[PDB]
Amino acid sequence: NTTSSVILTNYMDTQYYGEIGIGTPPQTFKVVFDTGSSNVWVPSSKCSRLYTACVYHKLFDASDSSSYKHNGTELTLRYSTGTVSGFLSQDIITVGGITVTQMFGEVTEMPALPFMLAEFDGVVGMGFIEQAIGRVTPIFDNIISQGVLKEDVFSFYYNRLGGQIVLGGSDPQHYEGNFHYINLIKTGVWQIQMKGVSVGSSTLLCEDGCLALVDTGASYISGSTSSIEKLMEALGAKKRLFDYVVKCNEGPTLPDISFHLGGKEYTLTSADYVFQESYSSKKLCTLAIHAMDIPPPTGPTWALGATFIRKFYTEFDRRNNRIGFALAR
Ligand SMILES: CCCCNC(=O)[C@H](C)C[C@H](O)[C@@H](N)C[C@@H](C)CNC(=O)c1ccccc1OCCCOC
Structure with missing residues (x-):
């Protein structure tokens, strides 16, 4: 009963994002902690070169990680600003302090507008299981299934350190x-x-x-x-x-x-x-x-x-x- 926190970076007041580590040894990635979706997703090494997006972002390659077990379900994510699509995998995300075994989509078709204007790489949703495409227990609901946090709540600060997320508190x-x-x-x-x-x-x-x-x-x-x-x-x-x-x-x-x-x-x-x-x-x-x-x-x-x-x-x-x-x- 603890309170961790993610320092976030601010890019030009239009984009705030942070770090997670997928895999053993940690493969880092910058991601957006989104309260309006519920999947974790990181571009894949399998993302064909034609996605001007994928070639210019840090991207996952399971090949390098002891703990990657895996599943291969295609899932398709229709954010209000584009679609992305890939299959999904298993391994560990440690989000600011907490490590948990998560299912995340490894994306592949990853469309240029707008993912080409994004300094982040992936997205870590923090919405309810009700909209986890693939109905997959979401990262916040796992930090809480091995519950360590003080209150099962979290809060966002976005500065005018660019800002911070606090897990378990405020x-x-x-x-x-x-x-x-x-x-x-x-x-x-x-x-x-x-x-x-x-x-x-x-x-x-x-x-x-x-x-x-x-x-x-x-x-x-x-x-x-x-x-x-x-x-x-x-x-x-x-x-x-x-x-x-x-x-x-x-x-x-x-x-x-x-x-x-x-x-x-x-x-x-x-x-x-x-x-x-x-x-x-x-x-x-x-x-x-x-x-x-x-x-x-x-x-x-x-x-x-x-x-x-x-x-x-x-x-x-x-x-x-x-x-x-x-x-x-
Ligand atoms: C089908 C599953 C998703 C269903 N829900 C939704 O689509 C939500 C309503 C909307 C969704 O949460 C968006 N908030 C997703 C978020 C990743 C939006 N980001 C982008 O579109 C984006 C792309 C390029 C550049 C910037 C973008 O926004 C990032 C802003 C981050 O700074 C906080």
Whole structure:
């Protein structure tokens, strides 16, 4: 009854990831600890060269590890941003301190957009067994089957060390006072119910309730293409191919937005959601909010990612199905 923790790296506020070690001797890999999926996956040595992705990433080759026993099931993972596909294997992942014998997919068809823009290599999901493709007991549920942790919970800090995950606890030197929690909606997904999105100080989006996937594996707040299309229109931002945008001098006047989450209002001012890489006019800055249409059944939902976890430290509490936000630091 212990509390370990993963130091995480921050790349440009859009990508936070960490280290695990698959295999004996350890084969390291950078991975994203994702609360919105539930598989572990690392590119394979079998990943044919044609995947511009696979050739440019660190990749697993069982060949070198005493403990790799194996199974060969094809599994196919349909993340909301692409698909990846490979078979799955057995061996040990040690995730920051804890070693466990895990099933992970070794991927192979691994599509360029977007895996070619990713500094990480794999993904370690931390969602419920309800969406483990292949219905395979997920890494968090194994740290807890050989249960060593203090509380069977974990929390994410994403810095503005790039950030940290704490297994079994909450480093209470990275937040200001007491998480307020929110019990779940479904069980099976880290999704909470959001009742009302506001800008300025009037509810403009989401008045008869909407859903919210809290997703550590996402860079920005995302919303369905309609709703973001109106969110931006009240912010006055402008579209430009990959993202809404507004010219850097107007930055500190774009109004604040407040996600009504559970009991209090999570307010994000423009310094929080705008990449003020220059307060000047003439260049025009990016907004950290994006349209994404997550498909049924998890979605259609807003998904609050890194733009949000960065202002609120987030504790995901398995034991009694609550997520709990507490102000940053
Ligand atoms: C079919 C199994 C998955 C079903 N669930 C889902 O698809 C979720 C709703 C979404 C999923 O959790 C995503 N969060 C997955 C995550 C790996 C998304 N990452 C990427 O798409 C990605 C790719 C390239 C570059 C960046 C990306 O995001 C990484 C952001 C990490 O910084 C925290």
